[PDB]
Design a protein around this ligand. Sequence first.
Ligand SMILES: OC[C@H]1O[C@H](O[C@H]2[C@H](O)[C@@H](O)[C@@H](O)O[C@@H]2CO)[C@H](O)[C@@H](O)[C@@H]1O
Length: 413
Amino acid sequence: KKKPLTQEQLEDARRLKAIYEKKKNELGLSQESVADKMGMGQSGSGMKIEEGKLVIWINGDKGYNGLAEVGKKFEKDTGIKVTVEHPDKLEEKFPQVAATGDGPDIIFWAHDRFGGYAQSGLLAEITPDKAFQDKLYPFTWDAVRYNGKLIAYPIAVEALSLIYNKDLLPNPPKTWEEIPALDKELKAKGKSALMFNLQEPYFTWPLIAADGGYAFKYENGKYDIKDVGVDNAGAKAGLTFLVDLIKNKHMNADTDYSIAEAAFNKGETAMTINGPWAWSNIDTSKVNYGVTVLPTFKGQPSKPFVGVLSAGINAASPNKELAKEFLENYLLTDEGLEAVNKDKPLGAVALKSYEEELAKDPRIAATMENAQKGEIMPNIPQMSAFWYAVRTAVINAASGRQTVDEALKDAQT
Ligand SMILES: OC[C@H]1O[C@H](O[C@H]2[C@H](O)[C@@H](O)[C@@H](O)O[C@@H]2CO)[C@H](O)[C@@H](O)[C@@H]1O
């Protein structure tokens, strides 16, 4: 308190403070900190994610109610509350919130996005022992391995199939090339041959890859990011066929997931292209449907990009042990996967014991044959940029805003 200070000394300090404050106000920071704007300090205090519970994000097309049921079982046994959410644009929101040390404890998505999350430091290395690993197929662990480390638990192996209305079309086409004539036939009955989501490149990729399109060349155990196959002859032939379908009025460039689903389930179109998650709504519909191998293009199989639905653990989570216990001992069991599967079908699961049951289902057999004909997606960090590039190319080529040659030239970097 009692200091040997004169008014002149205090005045000198007053002036220095005022010089500082004058600059601060001129910089428009009357209400903010200088050090914050310099990106100094932290963000944040390492405690945004609540300790002692689990928050889980999964896409809204998956069996999130069945997953929440597994969460309730977990809570009954352990007292740990599990909250399941399905935010829109989850795969964009997760990296944004997790970068700040926030977000869910566990994030579900196909494995392709996970290498980018891991490179950004957003995903924990997972630690299942060999005995647990032995319960899932080796190729599924491979999909979630990034630079030697396991960075997610694999859940299910997803591939697109051709889904068809057996009453309108007891005999589904073998080839993409048959579709225009089939559409002309069905149009005379007030129906169309085929509708599927043209807004997400996932759905058009199997045709683009058929005759030779590819994302990143894989050689000697590594992906060459300098060798991209989005604008080669095969990719062009595939996308040109799609564009010709639109030019010839066999499909509408505007068709999206809900337009195609509503039209197929109402019985207005004879075929759609979709994954196992979609089977539940068709089951509810009046449609008698089959699930079969995708049409060939130029005599070669369609090659869907295969996604392994996977559960990653937020690096910021203080609940990594709770998450491990939940995922290994509750979800990845016959009863856990059945709960999710009964809600929206997972397709072919990574867990050997449960996959052996489901394999009897002809819809799963067809999923697996389409998966086998395609390729497991890379998980490299360049995947997000690839998908954005191809999404743009397909939408622009389909709508006619650009030619196929120009759109694919733009996508190639
Ligand atoms: O369309 C690009 C998109 O494809 C894949 O997303 C799939 C996903 O794997 C399926 O689980 C399902 O939810 O439909 C999505 C397509 O709408 C990639 O996994 C994704 O990263 C990519 O953006």
